[PDB]
Amino acid sequence: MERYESLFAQLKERKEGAFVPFVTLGDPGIEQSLKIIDTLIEAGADALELGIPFATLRAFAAGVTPAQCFEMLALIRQKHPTIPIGLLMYANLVFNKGIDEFYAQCEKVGVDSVLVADVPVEESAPFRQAALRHNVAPIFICPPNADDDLLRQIASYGRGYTYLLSRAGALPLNHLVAKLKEYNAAPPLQGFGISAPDQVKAAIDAGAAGAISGSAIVKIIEQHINEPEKMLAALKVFVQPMKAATRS
Known part of the structure; x- marks a missing residue:
């Protein structure tokens, strides 16, 4: 079963867009990180983007060891079987424990996709192979100034969804989503600098399938680091408007 594909189908039927929050796994702590994630979902998150x-x-x-992160990931999967879970990280961790061994560990845990930030699409073969081999979806970034060549690659390589970088990472987002659709690429999600509901709305009108937010959620986490109860309440208040901005 492919989470993203299934999720996107349900959204398109409701003329709704996806709101995908981002949070670093283990912030401020293992216990808290799991509660902020339950809340994020409870508030309206359609998918998770975990760092x-x-x-x-x-x-x-x-810090939180790699083992602890995969343990959290497993717990999250158990409580939320249907929600797409995508990871965001650097090649470093993948090399540390072997490529194929890392993607296998993701298949075991249940992550649906992985995005290696510091790895060019040109030299991603070993990552794509290991991902496809374990039913994981390899994700690639699509810059707003990408030429036709790169668009054809990311479109033929990626699965699940493609990461559409914001001009603030250059052509209009409206134009990129069209090229991606023409090349039959996975649904695009905008992800840089979206911290307001009005910004999420624009992304969706431009044709994007959803939006990703990180900073805005992090700030709330650190502004209530020593107020867990109040922190969760502040997260909900912030996610509602964001997710609402994705509806029709």
């Missing part, structure tokens, strides 16, 4: 972070002092080797 994976990566002997002396207990403040140097801090």
